């Protein structure tokens, strides 16, 4: 069902696939029926010709990657690199442009080094959070990792896409240090201290000397990353996870105001996440257990869910790290910041009367333990796919309540339950909207797509721009960053054409196309 | 005395200078006698044709910068951008290539915003640490800045060169967020959230969307930065600076071993700096006050200096930040790490019996107060210039003692006093050598240059590479990063040729030349 990419003959694509099998072995080129796991699991498009991978190649080594790229250049065949291809909600493993060949690097799954005394790992793209965690536990190394939830994905791939987690080390790409890259011309480079032969500092110091370029290979089609370093947090002297609940939907305004100073100054040591009722309820319950109506849940049902589950309309999870005197002092500051809000409640794990419970689950994540759960937002409405919209805004009550109002209104009018959170990294607020939908139903897919377009449009007019998005929306989000007639993308295109003149790496990633396709 | 740059006619250079004065006004083009402050203050070269600026232009605004660059392209005339041009020990304001016109941006000195609730500033390149500090004190804003010592320089220029300071915010470029850049083609771009019109998040979130490119404009000739954001630390709830001295030169091995875990885990909240006797003595004394010999100081004199000044052979300055219970807990951990070393002593300010004193001075710096001092290493030998060599290494005793041994041996054999420190950022050790010399004396200049070359060569063979260097050595340091036949510089050159095909921005910065001069 997948078309050849525009400009590429069937002869060309056939020679390429052939030379690919000479490079990796015939068993490691997939076509035809074996392509289905490279499809987006959470379909949005109703046009079945969109975002369709033609083929996949799975190399064993950096140098194989290089040969493939050289062949790609030779026949004009475009590649879409994935590390493990678990980018669910963002298109999974699927390309922007139909007919692109997937460059699957899952087989390159070596943990090249884990260093306990300097707190780092050097990993290939195939390495999962589960495998890294399991390695560390197995060797008994006193290190924590930082994981998404749910905890599927590549350490490399998630970091390159600017992914996040729930410890002090939650900004994954900020913790990156050193990479090896195959450039679009097939040359291989190492960044930072890795460009110096005989260094023992690749993972100890980011910059090296000269222009700092690691960042240009994140959210990018400027090269293929084959090795990447990441800093790992030493196991702390203590760990106390907490949940603060708030009774009223309006509380999120004053909560955000109080969060701002604690986060700017670092009194809260990890990202602060304040989740709406449904998002946290969906960890241990489904909709049909509280309401049989087709549409979003009414208020009386909300109050029932709150009483059963000991949750609020807003649910703030964070954690304390370090020696008990430190944790005690920080807690005093945090708790005092919220004590005077009517209806507030404060919980540590021992205060949770349920044995299967939101805090108990999130406590795992904020300690860097990768988990899958039986229930999460995906099962709230008995199944479906999801998409997320997570634009950046200032940490103010005004911005938080305005986004909650704007988004919840539209989401509910479209027939979806509102599932949103307010996330704070350091100085950055994100109102994150999660929309679960029936990806098998074309009428729902249309509604979802339309809702998504409108949410982005209306958010952008208030000055809130997206930092990470699905393959289907990459062009749209790029057009948000339109200052001076798209001057920044004009520079990205200049760099693209110099590094990749034949435009063979992931055409359209981050809205970057290349001279032959612009 | 300054030659035209190679390839540029006298006609061409004359038209350019003319059009420059049409752009900025005739009063803001300097030539002839007014060029002398653009010379390197600490001459190394004995060839007086090297590193000589032909002229200087001082624009008032971004858009003037753009016009200049467009004219530079038109006549083939190369520019060397400076923010304030206080890069002393690195060449001052002077270019790598003689005949380059200095683009002096000192007049662009607006503090565009200082935001107390979100802890940031947006500054133009002319803004000094002194001016930023003075602004904040004047408005009574509860923010600290992070300053070099001595505290001259541009907030922008120092950060772009990967400069450092002495608070938790000591990695200046890591604290950068958002910039405006004039590209070598004269187009203007804003990075991150600044590329979205109507954002209020330029200084709140680094990435924006897509490839992260801010880094490529650091230590670079890829564009001219005209505005830059930087995060500022909220004033903490307490501040306790300390000095730990060690009696024996050999102690630095075990000291580095003990520093490693404290720094990796962040128990020490700022950079750790362990300075040799002379470097700290030179803050309050000169050589001739303790020894009249021409050569380096003997051991008996060292012991005299230690007893007078309450200093050791090694002197560790750091500081505690936050609420007293936190500072108390961290101090316990730090002090216990070193208590068992024979001859160790521990001081807070009230324990220093001298009123003019190393700890009292460094206490200012580790609180982000910019200062000049009457005495520092520059006056140790009655005057001269300086150069520094600060390569990266792992935080081990073995690496520290090996570098101390290697460097002190050669430095002393050349007739200089050893002045060195062990600096730790987070995971990175730097043995920093400071060499003070008589920049007026050509025999000393020759010795210094030779010593410098040899120190770099021998360090690099042990796997220790430099991250920041003088204009004279930029090509040399680039050749350190030589893996895969200089593959990283080959990529930098690809980017240079695409962004700057006429090679008019700072030819030779970081060893990056451009097609017309390679
Ligand atoms: C229920 C749910 C919860 C989620 N929770 C989180 C969360 O808490 N935090 C979070 O950050 N994300 C979260 N996500 C998003 C996503 O699932 C994770 O971020 C996941 O870790 C990303 O997949 P990956 O690691 O395999 O990346 P990949 O799919 O391997 O890579 C992502 C993209 O990066 C680029 N890329 C990858 N590898 C390379 C390479 N080697 N060289 C060049 N470019 C490359 C490509 O553009 C690729 O499409 C969630 C998703 C869902 C569905
Ligand atoms: C005694 C002594 C002590 C020192 N102590 C320290 C210290 O503690 N910490 C430290 O970090 N340094 C230190 N230094 C080095 C130096 O003095 C400082 O780093 C100083 O702040 C740098 O000068 P500047 O800020 O004006 O940078 P500039 O000279 O303005 O800029 C430096 C370089 O960056 C580039 N550049 C600058 N601005 C731009 C722009 N807008 N766009 C593009 N490229 C640009 C150019 O390559 C330029 O040559 C010390 C030096 C001496 C002599």
Numbering used by the authors:
A (entry chain A), B (entry chain A): 2 to 519
Structure paper excerpt:
One of these, the 4-phenol oxidases/dehydrogenases, catalyzes the oxidation of para-substituted phenolic compounds. A fundamental distinction is that the oxidases efficiently react with oxygen producing hydrogen peroxide whereas the dehydrogenases hardly react with oxygen and typically employ other proteins, such as cytochrome c, as acceptors.
We further studied the P151G mutation to assess the effect of removing en bloc the side chain, and P151N and P151T to test the introduction of hydrogen-bonding groups. Spectrophotometric measurements confirmed that the vanillyl alcohol-reduced P151N and P151T proteins are hardly re-oxidized by molecular oxygen though they retain dehydrogenase activity while P151G can effectively turn over using oxygen as co-substrate and the product is formed. Conversely, no tunnels are present in the wild type and the dehydrogenase mutants where the flavin re face remains fully shielded by residue 151 and Trp153.
